[PDB]
Amino acid sequence: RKLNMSILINFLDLLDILIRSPGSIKREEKLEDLKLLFVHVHHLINEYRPHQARETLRVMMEVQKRQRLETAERFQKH
Amino acid sequence: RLLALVKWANNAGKVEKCAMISSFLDQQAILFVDTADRLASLARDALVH
């Protein structure tokens, strides 16, 4: 939530820092800075996937028990 | 020809001003596109990785 405002404000600050100083070197560090920010969002977002991956595992264990009971009861009925 | 040269000799200021102004814009023009290119390059390659 904090990173989003910063990249956006920088985008807006990079828009007018060109006019405030065209020949200044800091514009390419801002792009790089922008690139660094891009490296960060993807890096931070990827944090969720391992936890997400773990959740997928539980249903497989869970669904079979939901399936095995049905087979046993059906067999008993037959 | 010599007379034309020596008449233009004092009229070498405004042409130089126009030339340097055009170069400034041209020099600047390479810079805006380069920045745009960098942004374009990053989306295409950095995002994918």
UniProtKB/Swiss-Prot annotation, chain A:
This protein's name: Mediator of RNA polymerase II transcription subunit 7
Family under the similarity heading: Belongs to the Mediator complex subunit 7 family.
Record note on modification: Constitutively sumoylated.
Phylogenetic lineage: Eukaryota, Metazoa, Chordata, Craniata, Vertebrata
Subunit structure: Component of the Mediator complex, which is composed of MED1, MED4, MED6, MED7, MED8, MED9, MED10, MED11, MED12, MED13, MED13L, MED14, MED15, MED16, MED17, MED18, MED19, MED20, MED21, MED22, MED23, MED24, MED25, MED26, MED27, MED29, MED30, MED31, CCNC, CDK8 and CDC2L6/CDK11. The MED12, MED13, CCNC and CDK8 subunits form a distinct module termed the CDK8 module. Mediator containing the CDK8 module is less active than Mediator lacking this module in supporting transcriptional activation.
Residues of the full protein shown: 79 to 156 of 233
Entry function: Component of the Mediator complex, a coactivator involved in the regulated transcription of nearly all RNA polymerase II-dependent genes. Mediator functions as a bridge to convey information from gene-specific regulatory proteins to the basal RNA polymerase II transcription machinery. Mediator is recruited to promoters by direct interactions with regulatory proteins and serves as a scaffold for the assembly of a functional preinitiation complex with RNA polymerase II and the general transcription factors.
The organism's place on the tree of life at top rank: Eukaryota
Subcellular location: Nucleus
UniProtKB/Swiss-Prot annotation, chain B:
Expression sites by tissue: Ubiquitous.
Signal peptide from the UniProt entry: none
Compartments it resides in: Nucleus
Domain of life: Eukaryota
Subunit structure: Interacts with GATA1. Component of the Mediator complex, which is composed of MED1, MED4, MED6, MED7, MED8, MED9, MED10, MED11, MED12, MED13, MED13L, MED14, MED15, MED16, MED17, MED18, MED19, MED20, MED21, MED22, MED23, MED24, MED25, MED26, MED27, MED29, MED30, MED31, CCNC, CDK8 and CDC2L6/CDK11. The MED12, MED13, CCNC and CDK8 subunits form a distinct module termed the CDK8 module. Mediator containing the CDK8 module is less active than Mediator lacking this module in supporting transcriptional activation.
Function text: Component of the Mediator complex, a coactivator involved in the regulated transcription of nearly all RNA polymerase II-dependent genes. Mediator functions as a bridge to convey information from gene-specific regulatory proteins to the basal RNA polymerase II transcription machinery. Mediator is recruited to promoters by direct interactions with regulatory proteins and serves as a scaffold for the assembly of a functional preinitiation complex with RNA polymerase II and the general transcription factors.
Family of this protein: Belongs to the Mediator complex subunit 14 family.
Designated name of the protein: Mediator of RNA polymerase II transcription subunit 14
Gene name of this polypeptide: MED14
Shown stretch of the complete protein: 98 to 146 of 1454
